[PDB]
Design a protein around this ligand. Structure first.
Ligand code: GTP
Ligand code: GDP
Ligand code: MG
Lengths: 107, 429, 292, 91, 427, 50
């Protein structure tokens, strides 16, 4: 909703949301968010913005490995739903990251 | 010594320069191989022994017209480093040729001018050929002339510019490109000779009797106009004129530096044998409105100053008889504050005849370059065109996204509007 | 008579907010591309553009005269720009938290601004200093507005409380907790009698100034409604939704009257032109298309 | 020009007369250069060709660029506008 | 030196591309083996725009051929001039789109879109300076429409300053090759507006009008339509490959034909289309080219130019011509019928003169025209789309691949945005 | 190549057969016997036909 849209605008990402479910599927936007919240840990150089299934799995695997190392938890079922493009998984992952990074509430 | 550096910008620049340098190598007898089998020092710098190179640069952003010089019949004439070509053209965009794609090629252009300027001892001026209706000619010609003023101060600049025609033109965004280029040449060019392709089209149709004239036909008799302007520097004559002599007898105010052009004897050989070309008969054909090289009516305006460039077997007596009979004619009209408005220049060489041109072999010729208030008609016609297109922002995103800001359109519109106001009030009684 | 007739675009990221000139047919939009663009309805082309904000411009607002336009961005910057010379007069960055909304006074001398520090500040264009700061919400103030005549300042925040205040003395007169969730936009009527509150429930509730009587309660789409406006005709209320629909509800004709589903993404700004026939809507699809 | 120089309304003019006409049209053409085109236009003519045929052959064989005259001393892809899959042949 | 990268999609793009590479290599003098057999020096001066020099003097075209059906690239190897192409650029699928826009754009096209971008990046960096990307594909299909518009979206984002040429063939008014054309056509043109710098509309039943009425072909082969398409595509890139009196590349055509950014949909036509019976009776002159160029039956779109006023126009003249007599035909055609030309653009027609005619032809011309009459063939597709989508028919083969019904309303509204802005210039 | 050459050969053979029929009908004089005058001399200028 409005809080997570304000939060994703405030990071000033290169990728524009529009259809957010299709936009965040490749993992480039969540990689950008994670890189903004951890500049030293995650860089945009190690991620390829492509619609390929293998490259998508590579980006999400790096993201999963680094967030598992750093303690931040996102659901693997939500990751599978994001890479399969089911409706609402991208939304739920966005609010989960919104609560995880800088903790607020969801209405 | 006396030397002029000719700078040709854009597609119109290269092809006019191809016809111009064809004529100049024929006047001095320079072969296309580059070897002559002391007058050539105005246009040719004799490099060592047995070689004469042009004092010109052929710069255009598209390579497709620079290369045809490099593989044409003039391969061995031009210096290979003076012909400058880029990757992609400005593509009819003033914003490209000025700001984005033109800045990385003007630095190599100024370096080539510096080598050409330091070689010649006494430089008379820079002759600039450009088309204000195009991308490179309006855009790169603007940025080059900005750099020529700030670096080479007080040195005269002459602009033989091709200006868009009222009736027919070859592109759509010429009213944008020509209006923006008006401010570039208003404050910088010391002499601006207006050329209109429709007028030269009508000159060819009624004089040379060519029903289908071509760009090559047009550039050949533009070259006779440029040659007769500089004919007094190269070859001796009774009434010598210089580049500095040309300005001071034509421009009475700094902001009024626009002049017309008219080459009076333009005949084929079937015209030539039945025509007794006298000085008085030719001079009456110079001031004829049909023989003007820009589509404006001198009857609508009034003459401010005029320059008469005579060549060949012209006595200094009958040139004065031609001036006296022109002054008594009521069809022309002069401003009351210029009672002696004529400049007469007589040379002792007939014009050369190119094998391949429609012009015949004539004994005497006249190039008449006059400043008048009829040039306000020329800018007023494209003032209506540019104000029509800009009113709803058509063809603007090509300019705005390419570096240029929106406010440069209205500033060039107010500058062009102020130029109209100056021409109306100066000729007013 | 509400359909799609013209479209206005020219932004790369989502459009955050939009407004119109007080007596001219020009629409100024502030998007996430760190710029504010003014476009003309009759031609569809831009007239002016301003840039210089470091981050996404969260909202824009105009004074009653329309000479000075305020823009609050995500980098805690409030920039005041004059349209006569295209010059940014002032750039107030005293806040360290994200700014949401602005609202000029009746005379246009000072403008209130909401930030993420749970407070509403007052800034002056000539002085460039905080004149008065008020705190009556536990969350970020999402919207601020002023009555046309009196000092009735309405502040809406995410704490489900709409505060009617007297900001001249720096005090809040009262707070009403009618909203069941976070509030994003409060839109007054032509006068100051009625104020309509936006909420995450998706209801257009038009409470009174002090009585707070919900005369009409209506439902919106599944997503949370974010932007609200009232037509100058006195019978139409426009409410945007994040589900891609703009609802024009009639006051005296069956509550909900018209639905426009031309938009494809979340709409965050809605307004009506001074003529009264056309509405200007925004969205997250970077298309501030004006509905006829 | 050829009609004006033709004194007998023949339709033909001799080699010297056509050299004069060509020099009147553009100065600098040699008489040998005119006579070569005479022989190309009409090989078995004893003296004088049709100036209509001369002008017609020159205008039909004229080219735009002087570079591509060098090939003058397989039908074409676009000149057929048919048999679209028969453009060129195997082996 | 101003290179054009050709990319072909689907059965149509490979068949269009096969005839395109036959025509261009014929006028360049390039044999099917790979060597050079020309008779003039003008062919080798500008040959890098379309052909990459290889080892041994062979010239290999700068073409990337893609399709999700692997048997179709066997048809382009089987076609003549089929061994000139590099085997590495022949990126192939296995499944096949099957006239589904969603299969080519999200589900099955995504696994192949990484390798297509891999060879496009390799091909673009090899040449010195790009001049644009040229694509020929379909809008009614599933591969040329689905996988094509994803590629156009991808290469516009990566390379934003480079031109875009789409010779996209559009579904027909009268008779349709497949039922699901409006679903693919509306979704393709939604992605074409914000990505393609300029689009050139072709229709098959407009091509059949040329082959029947003008060419007098009683039984036109399906490859004869590609001959007319290849004649035009060779004419757009005429001034780059050959010298001329007035030169005009693809960027100069874009800046003259496009007054406003979204109005980049043109309709085109090749001029000297004459039958063999009437070949001897027509004088190949410039006025005979001009009035036949502006004729409605020549133009290769179903939209008639007589219905709506011309916004802009472009003429590309090739051969031995006169600049005045070319230009005076353009001023004459703007005055004899001034109602069909827009009033707030003076000089609606741009003209370029090229000195090298096509091989075996003395003089030719190519037309490009931006008109407000082109909305007739977008409102027609919108008429087809609103009928099918309102009852939600033929939709389970689209919603099963990930996209929802809201994406259909994106393309439906954006189609109606283009016909709205075209209509208000017709007034 | 053989298939498309056969198609073009059929087209050209139909055209050539039509042209040959018209040429034969022109040469033998059977065509436009409706428009053929009688008495085998020019009726305006009294001269024999060729
Ligand atoms: N008189 C004359 N004019 C010419 C000639 N060649 C081109 N022009 C003029 O050039 C104008 C078109 O602009 P160009 O000069 O071609 O543009 P440009 O300077 O090459 O800049 P770009 O097109 O961006 O490369 C036309 O209006 C012509 O009038 C010529 O040979 N003679
Ligand atoms: N002009 C022309 N049209 C073609 C050609 N091949 C296919 N088409 C048209 O393209 C449409 C089908 O496109 P298709 O090849 O199936 O695209 P795909 O399935 O997405 O790869 C049909 O309407 C055909 O008329 C061709 O070679 N020339
Ligand atoms: Mg050019």
């Amino acid at each position: 909703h409005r809080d997570v849209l304000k939060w994703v605008q405030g990071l000033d990402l290169s990728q524009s949301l529009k259809n957010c479910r299709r936009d965040v599927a490749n993992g480039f936007l969540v990689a950008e968010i994670f890189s903004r919240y951890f500049p030293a840990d995650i860089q945009m150089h190690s991620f390829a913005n492509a619609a390929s299934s293998h490259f998508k799995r590579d980006n999400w695997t790096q993201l999963q490995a680094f967030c598992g190392r750093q303690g931040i938890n996102l659901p693997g079922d939500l990751v599978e739903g994001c890479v399969q493009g089911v409706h609402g998984a991208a939304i739920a992952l966005l609010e989960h990251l919104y609560e995880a990074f800088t903790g607020k509430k969801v209405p | 010594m006396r030397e002029v550096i000719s700078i040709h910008i854009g597609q119109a620049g290269i092809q006019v320069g191809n016809a111009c340098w064809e004529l100049y190598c024929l006047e001095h007898g320079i072969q296309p191989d580059g070897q002559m089998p002391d007058a050539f020092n105005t246009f040719f710098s004799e490099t060592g022994a047995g070689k004469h190179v042009p004092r010109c640069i052929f710069l255009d952003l598209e390579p497709t017209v620079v290369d045809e010089v490099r593989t044409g019949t003039y391969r061995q004439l031009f210096h290979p480093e003076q012909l400058i070509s880029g990757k992609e053209d400005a593509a009819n965009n003033f914003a490209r040729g000025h700001y984005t794609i033109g800045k990385e090629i003007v630095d190599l252009a100024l370096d080539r001018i510096r080598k050409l300027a330091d070689n010649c001892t006494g430089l008379q001026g820079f002759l600039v050929f450009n088309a204000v209706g195009g991308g490179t000619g309006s855009g790169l010609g603007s940025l080059l002339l900005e750099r020529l003023s700030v670096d080479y101060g007080k040195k005269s600049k002459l602009g033989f510019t091709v200006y868009p025609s009222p009736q027919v033109s070859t592109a759509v965004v010429e009213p944008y490109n020509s209006v923006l280029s008006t401010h570039s040449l208003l404050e910088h060019t010391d002499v601006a000779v207006m050329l209109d392709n429709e007028a030269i089209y009508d000159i060819c149709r009624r004089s040379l009797d060519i029903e289908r004239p071509t760009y090559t036909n047009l550039n050949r008799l533009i070259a006779q106009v440029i040659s007769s302007l500089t004919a007094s520097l190269r070859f001796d004559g009774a009434l010598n004129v210089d580049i500095t002599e040309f300005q001071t007898n034509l421009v009475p105010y700094p902001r009024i530096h626009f002049m017309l052009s008219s080459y009076a004897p333009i005949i084929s050989a079937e015209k030539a044998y039945h025509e007794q070309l006298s000085v008085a008969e030719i001079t009456n054909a110079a001031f004829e409105p049909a023989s003007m090289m820009v589509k404006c009516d001198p009857r609508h305006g009034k003459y401010m100053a005029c320059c008469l460039m005579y060549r060949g077997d012209v006595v200094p007596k009958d040139v004065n008889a031609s001036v006296a009979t022109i002054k008594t004619k009521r069809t022309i009209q002069f401003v009351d504050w210029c009672p002696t408005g004529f400049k007469c220049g007589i040379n002792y060489q007939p014009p050369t005849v190119v094998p391949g041109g429609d012009l015949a072999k004539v004994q005497r010729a006249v190039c008449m370059i006059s400043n008048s208030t009829a040039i306000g008609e020329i800018f007023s016609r494209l003032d209506h065109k540019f104000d029509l297109m800009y009113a709803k922002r058509a063809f603007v995103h090509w300019y705005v996204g390419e570096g240029m800001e929106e406010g440069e359109f209205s500033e060039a519109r107010e500058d062009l509007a102020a130029l109209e106001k100056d021409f109306e009030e100066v000729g007013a009684e | 008579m509400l359909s799609l007739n013209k479209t206005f675009k020219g932004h790369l990221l989502s459009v955050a907010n939009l407004a119109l000139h007080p007596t001219k047919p020009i629409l100024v939009t502030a998007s996430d591309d760190k710029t504010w663009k003014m476009w003309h309805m009759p031609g569809g082309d831009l007239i002016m553009c301003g840039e210089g904000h470091k981050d996404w411009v969260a909202g824009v607002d105009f004074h009653p005269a329309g000479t000075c336009l305020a823009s609050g961005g995500g980098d805690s910057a409030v920039k005041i720009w004059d349209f006569e010379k295209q010059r940014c007069v002032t750039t107030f960055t005293d806040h360290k938290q994200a700014i949401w909304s602005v609202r000029f006074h009746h005379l246009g001398e000072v403008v209130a601004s909401g930030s993420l520090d749970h407070t509403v500040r007052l800034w002056d264009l000539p002085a460039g200093k905080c004149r008065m700061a008020l705190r009556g919400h536990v969350d970020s103030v999402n919207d601020l507005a002023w009555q046309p005549f009196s000092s009735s300042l309405a502040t809406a925040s995410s704490d489900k409380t709409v505060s009617v205040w007297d900001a001249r003395a720096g005090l809040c007169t009262q707070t009403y907790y009618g909203h069941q969730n976070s509030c994003n936009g409060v839109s007054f009527n032509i006068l100051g009698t009625q104020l309509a509150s936006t909420d995450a429930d998706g209801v257009v509730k038009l409470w009174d100034t002090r009585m707070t009587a919900e005369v009409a309660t209506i439902n919106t789409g599944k997503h949370p409604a974010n932007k609200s406006c009232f037509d100058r005709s006195g019978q139409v209320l426009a409410v945007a939704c994040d589900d891609g629909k703009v609802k024009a509800y009639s006051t005296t004709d069956g509550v909900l009257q018209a639905e426009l589903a031309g938009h494809e993404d979340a709409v965050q700004a809605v307004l009506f032109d001074p003529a009264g026939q056309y509405l200007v809507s925004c969205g997250s699809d970077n298309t501030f298309r004006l509905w006829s | 020009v050829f009609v004006r120089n033709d004194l007998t309304r023949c339709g033909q003019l001799p080699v010297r007369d056509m050299t004069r006409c060509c020099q009147a049209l553009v100065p600098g053409i040699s008489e040998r250069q005119v006579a070569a085109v005479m022989a190309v236009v009409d090989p078995n003519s004893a003296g004088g060709v049709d100036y209509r045929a001369f002008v017609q052959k020159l205008t039909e064989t004229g080219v735009a660029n002087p570079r591509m005259l060098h090939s003058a001393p397989a039908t074409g892809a676009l000149t057929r506008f048919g048999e679209g899959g028969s453009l060129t042949a195997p082996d | 030196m101003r290179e054009i990268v050709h990319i072909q999609g689907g059965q149509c793009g490979n068949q269009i591309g096969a005839k395109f590479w036959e025509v261009v290599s014929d006028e360049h003098g390039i044999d099917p083996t790979g060597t050079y057999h020309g008779d003039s020096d003008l062919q080798l001066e500008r040959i890098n725009v379309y052909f990459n020099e290889a080892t041994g003097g062979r010239y290999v075209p700068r073409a990337i051929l893609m399709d999700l059906e692997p048997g179709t690239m066997d048809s382009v190897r089987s076609g003549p001039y089929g061994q000139i192409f590099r085997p590495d650029n022949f990126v192939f699928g296995q499944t096949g789109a099957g006239n589904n826009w969603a299969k080519g754009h999200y589900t099955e096209g995504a696994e192949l879109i990484d390798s297509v971008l891999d060879v496009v990046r390799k091909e673009a960096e090899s040449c010195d300076c790009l001049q644009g990307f040229q694509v020929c594909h379909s809008l009614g299909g599933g591969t040329g429409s689905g996988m094509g518009t994803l590629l156009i979206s991808k290469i516009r984002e990566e390379y934003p300053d480079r031109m875009m040429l789409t010779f996209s063939v559009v579904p027909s008014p009268k008779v349709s090759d497949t039922v699901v054309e409006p679903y693919n056509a509306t979704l393709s043109v939604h992605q074409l507006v914000e990505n393609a710098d300029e689009c050139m509309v072709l229709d098959n039943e407009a091509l059949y009008d040329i082959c029947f009425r003008t060419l007098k072909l009683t039984t036109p082969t399906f490859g004869d339509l590609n001959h007319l398409i290849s004649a035009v595509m060779s004419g757009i890139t005429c001034c780059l490959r050959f010298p001329g009196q007035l030169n005009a590349d693809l960027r100069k055509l874009a800046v003259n034909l496009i007054p406003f950014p979204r109005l980049h949909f043109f309709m085109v036509g090749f001029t000297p289309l004459t039958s063999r019976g009437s070949q001897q009776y027509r004088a190949l002159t410039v006025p005979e080219l001009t009035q036949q160029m502006w004729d409605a039956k020549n133009m290769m779109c179903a939209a008639d130019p007589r219905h709506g006023r011309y916004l802009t126009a472009s003429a590309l003249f090739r051969g031995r011509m006169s600049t005045k007599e070319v230009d005076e035909q353009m001023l004459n055609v703007q005055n004899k019928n001034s109602s069909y030309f827009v009033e707030w653009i003076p000089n609606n027609v741009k003209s370029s003169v090229c000195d090298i005619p096509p091989k075996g032809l003395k003089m030719s011309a190519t037309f490009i025209g931006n008109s407000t009459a082109i909305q007739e063939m977008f409102k027609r597709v919108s008429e087809q789309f609103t009928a099918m989508f309102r009852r939600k028919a033929f939709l389970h083969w689209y919603t099963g691949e990930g996209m929802d019904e809201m994406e259909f309303t994106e393309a439906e509204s954006n189609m109606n945005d283009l016909v709205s802005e075209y209509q208000q210039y017709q007034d | 190549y053989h298939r498309e050459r056969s198609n073009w050969e059929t087209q050209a053979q139909a055209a050539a057969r039509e042209a040959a029929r018209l040429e034969a009908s022109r040469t033998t004089g059977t065509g436009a016997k409706r428009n053929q005058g009688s008495e085998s001399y020019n009726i305006i200028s009294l001269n024999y036909n060729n």
